[PDB]
């Protein structure tokens, strides 16, 4: 996020990081329950990647994090790679996340829910702060 | 360019119609724009949350998807519209 600000450690408990075998963070995710993570389809997650929950400082070795194996990738059949539409993938974890003060789920809306233009929302992540 | 510590930013939701002004035909029903406010999601943010607080809790309204190749803070960021996809999510959890 460009022009963001550092979050209070553990205040976005559903925020997970998707890491490759090399420990490289390549995408964000959101816990919706102890066994499922919502992410973007274009993230191209594979069962060889790992879900990392409870992190604040990806550089710290002293945080109580949870490196969770992925049991299965569920890419929405409606996903269109060409237009990046219906960009959502579900990740079923092999072993359930242990919820804590720093690891919990985000709520999901109802299909009929209205989110009006002008509403102020928040986005979080470890993406570039400078392009 | 890449932060160690988790970043956050407040940003407004745009209407698809208004968003089409910036992105045109790239904008589909299953997409929701936010930003163009002095902040921008960027490479590595993808798949993360776009949450809105109401009646005390945070709801996933969007999923970081795409935007300006430059992460311009004056162009709206494009997120996967969760309302358009929540039915699929629920079905998927139900069946698995």
């Amino acid at each position: 996020i460009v022009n963001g600000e550092e979050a209070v450690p553990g205040s976005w408990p559903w925020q997970v990081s998707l890491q490759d075998k090399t420990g490289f963070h390549f995408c964000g995710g959101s816990l919706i329950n102890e066994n499922w993570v919502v992410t973007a389809a274009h993230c191209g997650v594979t069962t060889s990647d790992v879900v990392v929950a409870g992190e604040f400082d990806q550089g710290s070795s002293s945080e109580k994090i949870q490196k969770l194996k992925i049991a299965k990738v569920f890419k929405n059949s409606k996903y269109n790679s060409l237009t990046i539409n219906n960009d959502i993938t579900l990740l079923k974890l092999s072993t359930a996340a242990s919820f804590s003060q720093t690891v919990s789920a985000v709520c999901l809306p109802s299909a009929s829910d209205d989110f009006a233009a002008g509403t102020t929302c928040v986005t979080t992540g470890w993406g570039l702060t400078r392009y | 360019n890449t932060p160690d510590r988790l970043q956050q930013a407040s940003l407004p939701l745009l209407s698809n119609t208004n968003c089409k002004k910036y992105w045109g035909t790239k904008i589909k029903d299953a997409m929701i724009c936010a930003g163009a406010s002095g902040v921008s999601s960027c490479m590595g943010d993808s798949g993360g949350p776009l949450v809105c607080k109401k009646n005390g809790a945070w709801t996933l309204v969007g999923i970081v998807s795409w935007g300006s190749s430059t992460c311009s803070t004056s162009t709206p960021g494009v997120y996967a519209r969760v309302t358009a996809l929540v039915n699929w999510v629920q079905q998927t959890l139900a069946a698995n």
Binding site: Q101, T102, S104 | -
Partner: peptide
């Protein structure tokens, strides 16, 4: 869901 134990500060 949706209520952080540790409240985020915007």
């Amino acid at each position: 869901c949706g209520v952080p134990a540790i409240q985020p500060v915007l």
